[PDB]
Amino acid sequence: KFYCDYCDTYLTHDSPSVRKTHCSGRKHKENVKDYYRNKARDIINKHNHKRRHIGKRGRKERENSSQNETLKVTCLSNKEKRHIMHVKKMNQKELAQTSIDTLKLLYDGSPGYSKVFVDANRFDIGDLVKRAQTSRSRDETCESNPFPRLNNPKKLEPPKILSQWSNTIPKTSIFYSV
Amino acid sequence: VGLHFFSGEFWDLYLEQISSRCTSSKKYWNVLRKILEIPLHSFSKFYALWLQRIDDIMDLKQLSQLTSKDELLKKLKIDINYSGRKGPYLQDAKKKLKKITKEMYMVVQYQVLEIYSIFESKIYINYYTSPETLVS
């Protein structure tokens, strides 16, 4: 008697494909995805800090630090800090999931494009792609699109900038572009 | 090939390799500091990494990862060995470091935006096609 620990459904004793059928379905394929999302989410959310050993400060150490000044502490309200934490977590997720693919768009008309960037006709990991999109075939030749500039392509996307520093940008561009 | 305008992918590979292999976590700072000054196409991603990674610092001593103790004490007027109440002092150090990063970002943004506006926006072809091709 063996049961899945994710689905919690008790499964009549199996060892062959019956375990390769359960583990390849959907109630055991996405329900094992939600589990490890939560466990990895925790280790991201953990905020417990190291144990604090506070030693008795001496007079020579205290007098200099008392001489200088007192420092104000910035503090927010409950709703404000809730909103700020939500925003910061969302920003961290969005930046972490970001992948730069400028080189893939730049070589869109290369003579050997379909054999490298398509990622389905590659020679290393193509063996996996080789029941379930106008895919780019390997049989493309450079005669197709002899002149790329004939209005086919579009301008490169302008570089992104941080929104919290969006007033830093110069006000007016040097040249007048229509 | 590090100073390429479109060199974001190479630096992403370098940073992920450093973060995956290294455990001392000083080479990460020493490499992101260099990346911060190169006028790349995707400088914003590395500046966001820098801002988040400076925002997650938790104690005074880890500011020594950034620069030297003498440099911090002399230029930014931040004392790492400051003993007492360290909460507000660490917040002050974070504010000063973020101001310095903002000035760096001002310089780099001016450079990158000028380059893109003048030259890089007009170039459409970056690949060798054939001896029979004509370029505009």
Binding site: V87, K160, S163, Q164, S166, K171, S173, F175, Y176 | -
Partner: peptide
Amino acid sequence: MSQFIYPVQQQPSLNHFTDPNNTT
């Protein structure tokens, strides 16, 4: 809300110095 936004700028009003097509 995303932290990356496309840059926007104001035009310099098309005098003879700021015209990119000027050849004279």
